[PDB]
Design a binder for these strands. Sequence first.
RNA 1: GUGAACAGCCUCUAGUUGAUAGAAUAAUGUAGAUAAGGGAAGUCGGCAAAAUAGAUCCGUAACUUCGGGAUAAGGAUUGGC
RNA 2: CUCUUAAGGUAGCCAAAUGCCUCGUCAUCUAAUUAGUGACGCGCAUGAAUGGAUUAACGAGAUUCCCACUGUCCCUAUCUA
RNA 3: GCAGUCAAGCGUUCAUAGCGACAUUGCUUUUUGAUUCUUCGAUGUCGGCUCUUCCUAUCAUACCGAAGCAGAAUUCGGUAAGCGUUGGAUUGUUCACCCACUAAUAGGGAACGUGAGCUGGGUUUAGACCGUCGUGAGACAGGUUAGUUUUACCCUACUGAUGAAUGUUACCGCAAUAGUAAUUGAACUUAGUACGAGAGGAACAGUUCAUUCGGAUAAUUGGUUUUUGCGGCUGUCUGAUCAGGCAUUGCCGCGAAGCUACCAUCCGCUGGAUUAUGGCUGAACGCCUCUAAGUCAGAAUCCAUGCUAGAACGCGGUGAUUUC
Lengths: 136, 386, 78
Amino acid sequence: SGNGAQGTKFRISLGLPVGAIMNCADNSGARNLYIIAVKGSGSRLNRLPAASLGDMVMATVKKGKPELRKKVMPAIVVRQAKSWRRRDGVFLYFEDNAGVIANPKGEMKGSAITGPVGKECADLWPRVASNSGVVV
Amino acid sequence: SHRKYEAPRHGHLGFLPRKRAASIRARVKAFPKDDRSKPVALTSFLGYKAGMTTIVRDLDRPGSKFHKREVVEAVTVVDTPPVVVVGVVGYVETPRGLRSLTTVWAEHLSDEVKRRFYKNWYKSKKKAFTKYSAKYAQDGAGIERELARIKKYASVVRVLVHTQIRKTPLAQKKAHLAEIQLNGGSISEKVDWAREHFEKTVAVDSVFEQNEMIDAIAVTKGHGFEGVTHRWGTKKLPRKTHRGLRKVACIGAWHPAHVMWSVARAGQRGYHSRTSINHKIYRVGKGDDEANGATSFDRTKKTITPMGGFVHYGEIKNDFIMVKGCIPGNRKRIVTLRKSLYTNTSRKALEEVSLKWIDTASKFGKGRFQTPAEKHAFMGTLKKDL
Amino acid sequence: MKVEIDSFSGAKIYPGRGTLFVRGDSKIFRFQNSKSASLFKQRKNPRRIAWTVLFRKHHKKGITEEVAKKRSRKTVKA
RNA sequence: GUGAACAGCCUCUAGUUGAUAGAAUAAUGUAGAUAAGGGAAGUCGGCAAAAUAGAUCCGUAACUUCGGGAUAAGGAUUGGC
RNA sequence: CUCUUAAGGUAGCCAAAUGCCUCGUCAUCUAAUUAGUGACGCGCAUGAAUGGAUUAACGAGAUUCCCACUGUCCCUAUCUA
RNA sequence: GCAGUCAAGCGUUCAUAGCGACAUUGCUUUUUGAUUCUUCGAUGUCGGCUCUUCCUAUCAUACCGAAGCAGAAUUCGGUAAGCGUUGGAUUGUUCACCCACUAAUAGGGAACGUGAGCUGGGUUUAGACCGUCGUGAGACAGGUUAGUUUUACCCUACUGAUGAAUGUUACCGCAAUAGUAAUUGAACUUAGUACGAGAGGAACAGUUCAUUCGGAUAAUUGGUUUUUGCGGCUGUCUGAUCAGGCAUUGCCGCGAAGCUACCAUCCGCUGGAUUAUGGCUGAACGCCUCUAAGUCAGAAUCCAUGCUAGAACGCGGUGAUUUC
């Protein structure tokens, strides 16, 4: 949330607390991402900060290039795998959790995205909409 | 010491005591501020919660992503048969508050409202309002003077009504009685309206209208003696905890050497009287009409009643109020609706609502069909049918 | 508002009822209930489940939909 | 009988049918279980629990006192007719 | 070079269960490490059957990390006796 | 630890925008000591977990004032404690130190809150190792490893629940008292506008959403399954079949109802009096002056509206009031 956010976002259910791992859907050389923070999250005692489809997060790369490992970087969630409600009543989910690497103001370090992405992420990040093929 | 990590009070110290209500019918503790210019009508109605269903509608919000796009919402249905008027009373003002000086009743009371005055009806002469009924039949003497007393005093007038419980599928037979405050004008005209409506009924269309925001006042579902974890929302203590984990560890300090009112304790959950505001009416429906569940877009002649009935209630052969969202109370429970105490513009209390579709599939399952004819046309003929 | 069809059982899905599953190949399956969702995840075949439209089509149950066509017998007349 | 098996599980012979009962089914407990998505972020500490598990076939490292490590790791199969 | 001891700690080993200063310094592990491992060594106060240094296998021993697994936790809910 | 007074000087110029030496006056008791009053026929002495409340010496938020304040960011200060103040690596740790988020990641108290509330990592019995010291037994706020955490059924308090007596009984009600709840932020637009040489770069109103909290609810989704509801599977027993028993709910799948989840949905009021501050008139002081009389506006403040109970010794209205 924040800098590169084109618009707002409706609440959709949280599925990615800190310490979670989600696959990397782009071609930047990273295989998975490890979530350690969520931008826009509040502060309650013992609550884990938790991310949803379309949220920006701080991540580290555990498997991938040494150029990218061992440093924290921003990322965006594009698939959730938890069921979330759309205001048209549709509960839907993917079969995996996934995100992409990005810079703070919304741009991607990659050039392409494997697999589908959420419309609630395409709406909020246009550079993700551009490099996305299938939007569901 | 200086609690290591700050965090908010679990619960609201304003819905105390979390005690059982005195009655099953919650009491309206505030009616709207009056305007002595409008015509005379009620400010509240009585009905019975039936259940819920699902509603699809096109949204009208200039600025939302879902503008002029279809969204599905939850509503609740209140069976609201016509409410009978039996009596009024006159509250006048004192330095000790409002105070009633007279209760005027009607001549013929029905055998479903003169049960409310009994705890054992099956053995009784029924002998109620027999002398008050003979107080009539000399032209208007002992009644018109009382009404004149009300006109001569009584800054506030309230109408006593009773529900027609015998029209619902409930097995209760004992009508609910209640005072409802009129907010027309000219207390003389108020009481004259009442006198005209004695022994007569008021429909809900005369009170409420579509897109009107209301408040629901009802006693909430009872759950019993509950522990602190679910009652107040405290942490479960960890696993390796002797003498329980569904508790509150520290219930106070050595000094003040007492347990404080502010500490979460175990006790009653539910059967509280609650009052929930700003619930939009999405339909006002008539029992003198099939196609209560039909719309401009669907146009299939079906009632609001789902398949198999409403669960634990029945059918909705009477009038009803389809209102947005979840309201206090469980099914079969007397709700009292109330017009709002303030005009809320807000661009959400003014959205004019037109429904597209209504869910009449069974709530006794993962209901596939909305209609028996739909079911027959899909499944085809069966072994039962010829 | 559309009435989608169950991708396992052929049932009719009304709005706000059931779930949707987007597979990694970007295919969208639609389920009217947790029954058909679970059988999908248990990767059963609907041609073997006896209450499904696909089974009933495959086994010719309620098969009075389409019967036959005629054969042309006529001159040119021009 | 199952089964490698005086394992565990059911049964015959023989023996018991004893242990204060009844009615309801609140919290809190004890014993036992299940849980979306995440996956040790919990905690002094993965405590506890889960997961693994049999047999057959394949494959099997560092190191080594050359004897072991070793069921290493890790994979596949198993019914009935 | 000098003082000096009966001799003046050799081989080896080390912030080790032995190192006060000390969360020692460098590296590695981590997003982040008073933890761990590897190195360094003027070692308050290591050290040779007071046994020293190693060491395969074994260990209900102490310790760190990885995978798997999970209601430990996010965050609680439900069920049975 | 915190705050004042004075003001040589720093601050281009200028003591006091902000700081402020030499000196001095004080407050506090979240430091450590001093002392030994209480307690040795025992007040369970670390820390964390949990939970409440209080203070303000206010980190953030609301309103303001000053600036070496052009805008933006920042600093000083006032009313204010209403509402909030986190997630983690390491360490038993309090303390600390780093990663990150955030509006902010403020300090403290309540027997250094809290062990018949937990835990028991540490210290602080008995076992054992090292090093130094000691002839030695043994010693070491020197390190290391292992090491039983009892009782509430009494009184009170608290949370809930009944109930005698007021002619009886029933219905509708009033409302003293008590409590009280909402909070914060982002995007769009305002506007690349105002401001400024430029770099940069706002704000009010509005709209849409979200954070934290809270009260309900269960249409939908999800979870739960003794519906032992339907099916399936194992082993054995009932001669086979059909139908079933046992396997301390045998196991697997689906599973309605009910319960339930920011894992789901809905909802969360508008009016007055004020604080600081800025002002009006206006003398005192023939002028000037927000002040002395008087008075205007004004904060997340306070009181009402609203919301929760309803005095079991507060009240009202109304109905029916027993004969062999």
